[PDB]
Amino acid sequence: GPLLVSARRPELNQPARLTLGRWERAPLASRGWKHRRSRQDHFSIERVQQEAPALRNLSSRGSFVDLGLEPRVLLALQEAVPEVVQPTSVQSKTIPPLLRGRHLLCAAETGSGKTLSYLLPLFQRLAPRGLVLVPSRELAEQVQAVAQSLGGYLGLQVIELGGGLGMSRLKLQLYRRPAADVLVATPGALWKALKSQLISLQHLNFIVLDEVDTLLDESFLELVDYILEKSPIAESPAELEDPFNPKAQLVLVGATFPEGLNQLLSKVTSPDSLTTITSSKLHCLMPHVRQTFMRLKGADKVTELVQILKQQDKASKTEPSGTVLVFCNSASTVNWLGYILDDHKIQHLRLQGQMPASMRAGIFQSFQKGSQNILVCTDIASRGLDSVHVEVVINYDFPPTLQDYIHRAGRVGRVGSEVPGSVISFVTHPWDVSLVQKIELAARRRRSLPGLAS
């Protein structure tokens, strides 16, 4: 049968029909990955699905009308976003309760339609009318652009507010633009505006939290608390629809949820009033995406990295190929590797968190514009980055945690992906052998990775 796991050493190759189970320790291709003397021992997980899982079974999910969406909204949706002909599983389950004003918590993978899951009820339900909190500035640009595009069809104004921006420059943008019904802001900048009292949340009717796990980061945890005291929150859907006593509807969207979030939600609303929806593929390995694991030293990584680039160069020379995303853990390696790429006369982009905010915004848009097909970026780009046309994700530096890998993984195999996504990760020395062992073991058992519970 077709190999579920393919390795450089064939004796350990697995067929399409074998499951070992929890008690049995699988003989992984990374089980014995210790001594560098056996160079280049690799293994790739092949693509098992030819249809996109999000697009697959769309006919088996109820129509938008069944979700309570008005036909008038559908007509605007068809003009604004004709691409979404049918709702995904997350969209089907999430939209109906939101239109009813019930507080909703959505746990689903990237590219599953989470953004549209709440935006559609958000617009129909509707001194800002809606609030969107996003951890990274890059996500703010994407959400604001998506929200603005929908707003333009509905005659609504949307603006973006990025954290780390100067208070006097922050005010300049606000005064140069008309008042926005819905505001997309980062915790750092939004906290600055609230401290200066540039905006009032008493009239806020809708609050959106994206990447709650990232939003709950200690860098933004205190800022969120300051927002909460100034934010009136609805306790029941009845109060939400009460014109005499209007309150804010809370919606939560994330891929993972740290333990204790219920206590934070309990003090704001009853635990039984929280509607929790979990994606069937949440914390599950992606079969439709190819994952490549190569044994490379830091010196040898450059050799294989360029060899992979030559393969992509050869692939482009034969047929059109999608963009390649290169992930590096540290900026110093990006600059150090970037000079090597510059030495090779290779057009590439360099992105890291500490770059100037204005410079980063232009480069991010330029990559979206397709200015350069090769992008080297750090973990700041693993969140809120558009990767529809990205064919290969190259983790030059192995991701430190599974969650980062999932965020990097979500970039490939998104809805509307023009090219089949692939994932490549490099292990310099036996530093993260356990991480590779867990991934391979889960694939053989076809189980979720341990410790991913939300």
């Binding site: 450059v302 050799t303 360029v306 060899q307 030559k310 000079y339 090597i340 030495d343 090779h344 006369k345």
Partner: protein, 293 residues
């Protein structure tokens, strides 16, 4: 197909050969060249130039076996002769008409320069100040090569002389002139021969090497000496204003302190600092004339 015939050995590119992969890392990245001590030559003529100069090579990669037969295999002792794809040549070279030659990073003080320039080789040093153009650097070396400068110094920020593109710009000038790279200004006086008067062609970014408090008041009032006046009577040094930074502050201070002056070439507007190729060429030659006369 690797062939062993009548004492002549030449290999063929192997599937998965790591030897080729290391070439581009060595070839394209100068720090790796320093780390490994290797350089690349482009073209048969420049390749043949190194063989005549007796430069120590490392490896030859060639598309056609005819080149090996054309080349003297006796002089190919230190090179692994490997037949490679023409696609590999372009893959491993951004530029090579079927021939690629990797050579050991030569030591110019140890390089073999025969008599003909040595008869006219003087204790004259050509100094390029922050020369950031690889094309100028290689072609610049012709003037020092033809003039016969004993040794050449490049200030920090200058391009690597041993880069193949610079080798392309000079078309073998590196095998005709001794070169010292990444020379620190503090060590420049030691690099100068005894009694050397430093004469600087004066054309500015050197004002960025000054403390901000004293930046605007630290401009040296060095005497302007016309470059046509005799300066070779005793040991002398020539400084060239870089196309990017021009003449640095240290050069101006050194010339005044060393008993020299400004070997001032009036720099024509339209070229803020006389092109280092032009500034270098003019000064070196007629110094030979003055001494010959």
């Amino acid at each position: 197909h690797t062939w062993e015939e009548a004492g002549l050995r030449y290999d063929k590119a192997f599937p998965g050969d790591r030897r080729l992969s290391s070439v581009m890392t060595i070839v394209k990245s100068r720090p790796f060249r320093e780390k490994q001590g290797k350089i690349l030559l482009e073209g048969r003529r420049l390749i043949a130039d190194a063989l005549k100069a007796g430069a120590v090579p490392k490896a030859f990669f060639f598309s056609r076996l005819e080149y090996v037969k054309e080349l003297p295999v006796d002089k190919l002792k230190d090179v692994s002769l490997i037949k490679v794809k023409f696609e590999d040549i372009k893959d491993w070279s951004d530029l090579p008409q079927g021939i690629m030659g990797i050579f050991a990073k030569p030591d110019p003080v140890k390089m073999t320069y025969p008599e003909t320039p040595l008869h006219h080789t003087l204790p004259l040093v050509l100094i390029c100040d922050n020369l950031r153009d690889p094309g100028n650097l290689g072609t610049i070396l012709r003037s020092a090569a033809g003039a016969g400068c004993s040794k050449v110094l490049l200030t920090k920020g200058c391009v690597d002389a041993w880069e193949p593109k610079v080798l392309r710009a000079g078309m073998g000038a590196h095998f005709q002139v001794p070169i010292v790279n990444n020379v620190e200004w503090e060590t420049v006086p030691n690099h100068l021969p005894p009694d050397t008067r430093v004469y600087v062609a004066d054309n500015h970014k050197y004002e960025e090497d000054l403390d901000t408090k004293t930046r605007k008041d630290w401009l040296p009032k060095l005497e302007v000496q016309s470059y046509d006046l005799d300066w070779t009577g005793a040991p002398a040094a020539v400084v060239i204003g870089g196309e990017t930074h021009g003449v640095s502050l240290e050069s101006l201070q050194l010339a005044e302190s060393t008993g020299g002056k400004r070997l001032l070439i009036p720099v024509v507007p339209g070229v803020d600092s006389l092109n280092s190729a032009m500034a270098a060429s003019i000064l070196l030659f007629e110094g030979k004339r003055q001494l010959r006369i």
